[PDB]
Amino acid sequence: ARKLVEQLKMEANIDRIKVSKAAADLMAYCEAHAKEDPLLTPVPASENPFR
Amino acid sequence: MGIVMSLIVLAIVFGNVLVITAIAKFERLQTVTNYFITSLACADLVMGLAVVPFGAAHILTKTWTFGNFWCEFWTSIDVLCVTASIETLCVIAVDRYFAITSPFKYQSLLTKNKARVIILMVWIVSGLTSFLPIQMHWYRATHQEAINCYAEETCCDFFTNQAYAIASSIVSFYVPLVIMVFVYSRVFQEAKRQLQKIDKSEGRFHEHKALKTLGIIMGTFTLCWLPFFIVNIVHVIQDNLIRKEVYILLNWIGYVNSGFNPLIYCRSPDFRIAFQELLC
């Protein structure tokens, strides 16, 4: 009954930031942590444990 | 005829090699039934790679350019391959009979260990009738032409007595024929019964396939290997009745059957996908 209306009212009033800032933050994190991805950058076979 | 013989050799080798490599490479084709298929393919490949070229060279040059030992080895390999290429078909027929007639107990009865024993026994029986009585001189004939051929080291035909000719034929061809006939008759009866049941149950809303399949399977083998195994006894029972050219022609017609086994026993859609995956 009124539970759905109350929940919609509760979730309506929240702080929302611009999508551009979120995209920039995601890109910055991906670029910063891009040097420690063995799948993305194939590590030498000397340190490869599965091979 | 050299071009025709080379084409025959290429056709024999290519199909068997492709079947063997397709079975070995993939993991979804490793079934208990496929072990018999790969055994048959190995036998056919050994035949087409060992006995056909030397026979072609002998029939072309009309003079054996090797020693007596190599001729005896060639004859033994021929007999071994011919004997081992038919008992595998008999085993396949028996396996299908067991699979269809008794569906509940099939899974227990053939287990992979049980199969590697059957194949080894078949190969041992095949080798026990080819190498043993040929490396020893038990099969040697008695007429003067036979001794003249045996003494000579530049030519060697096939001369045999009555006992070996009857026994080898019985072991190789005649025994594995009645079993296959009975098996396929029972399978046809079961298929007809199932078709009648389906038609009686749900015929108001909705036997060529079984006839076609069994006809192809039985007819190719019978037409390929039947006349030779009759003239084999005929030329021994009655003297001066079968010419050497006719004997060689019938024997070479028998050889061609080894190149048709992939075309008959490897029509499954899984084999089609496997053949399309590689070399395509």
């Binding site: 979730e11 999508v19 979120a22 920039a24 995601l26 994190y29 991906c30 420690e36 | -």
Partner: protein
């Protein structure tokens, strides 16, 4: 009644606010980034011993051991380095659909059509506790801690359990369809869930109240993965699409789909850096996407049946897949 008409307004307000906040799309911002390029991986290990198809697996916290479940009623704990088994736990019921590996490496849990979540003690292998209370089949379970676990079942509810006493602590309600998957945040302070009503929700583990709702999809959701940054997640549904939602922006960002695929999606996972998104499909193979470009970078073929499980090690050294062909493969 009057209220139902009244309710729609709030939806219009939320849609207008989300449309207003959308300054620019992710594709426009991420256009000068150099592409990753073609990525090729080859099978390194193969694990055999399961008599039936595999639903679930979970990597260990040490990226060395892993657990797996099958429909023959047996859990096996493999050693990926030496490709030899360690344990083989029989099950009372042969229908299991999930499994989990505790962060402390001491317990392994599983469940299925029977509405019971069993917990096993590896370092004592006997049943330790049995949690009951769900009225539907379980779908997932993740060890929040060595003493408490959270589960999601087919009765449109998710619950938090207490292993010591075997009693429910918090119950999460609000979904309409059957909940199929969940994933925890790195700090274990929030978790998401995807039901069959094409809607994913954000839950608060402490308060026990739904915070946000996302309804971008149009079919049932089958898998959910959480971005390493802790402010995004990706979902996969039956319409051969993947979507990258956001929390702070409170809207989706990008969709991953192609016109040559008409199958479903069974599992979704990320990478250590988050650059690559891995998703399993019903085409008997897996795909690798680019998170910031939505451009395919490779395909992982080699499975003879549909892929139902997918996971990446904590240190990101290798990825493991499971299929209905009763085979587990390791891709480096």
């Amino acid at each position: 009644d009057q209220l139902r008409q009244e309710a729609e307004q709030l939806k219009n307000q939320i849609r207008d606010a989300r449309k207003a906040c959308a300054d620019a799309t992710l594709s426009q911002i991420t256009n000068n980034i150099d592409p990753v390029g073609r990525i090729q991986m080859r099978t390194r290990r193969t694990l055999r011993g399961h008599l039936a198809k595999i639903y679930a697996m979970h990597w260990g916290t040490d990226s060395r051991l892993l657990v797996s479940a099958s429909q023959d009623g047996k859990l096996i704990i493999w050693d990926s380095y030496t490709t030899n088994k360690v344990h083989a736990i029989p099950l009372r019921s042969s229908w299991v659909m999930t499994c989990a590996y505790a962060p402390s490496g001491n317990y392994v849990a599983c469940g299925g059509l029977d509405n019971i979540c069993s917990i096993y003690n590896l370092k004592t292998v006997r049943v330790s506790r049995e949690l009951a209370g769900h009225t539907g089949y379980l779908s997932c379970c993740r060890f929040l801690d060595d003493n408490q676990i959270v589960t999601s079942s087919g009765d449109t509810t998710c619950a938090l359990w207490d292993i010591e006493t075997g009693q429910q602590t918090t119950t999460f309600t609000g979904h309409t369809g059957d909940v199929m998957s969940l994933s925890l945040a790195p700090d274990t302070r929030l978790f998401v869930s995807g039901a069959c009503d094409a809607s994913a929700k954000l839950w608060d583990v402490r308060e026990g109240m739904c915070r946000q709702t996302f309804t971008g999809h149009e079919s049932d959701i089958n898998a959910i993965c959480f971005f390493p940054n802790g402010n995004a997640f990706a979902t996969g549904s039956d319409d051969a699409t993947c979507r990258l939602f956001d929390l702070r922006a409170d809207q989706e960002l990008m969709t991953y789909s192609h016109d040559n695929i008409i199958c479903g999606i069974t599992s979704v996972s990320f990478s250590k850096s988050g650059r690559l998104l891995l998703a399993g499909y019903d085409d008997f193979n897996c795909n690798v996407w680019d998170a910031l470009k939505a451009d395919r970078a490779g395909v992982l073929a080699g499975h003879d049946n549909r892929v139902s499980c997918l996971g990446v090690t904590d240190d990101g050294m290798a990825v493991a897949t499971g299929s209905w062909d009763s085979f587990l493969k390791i891709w480096n």
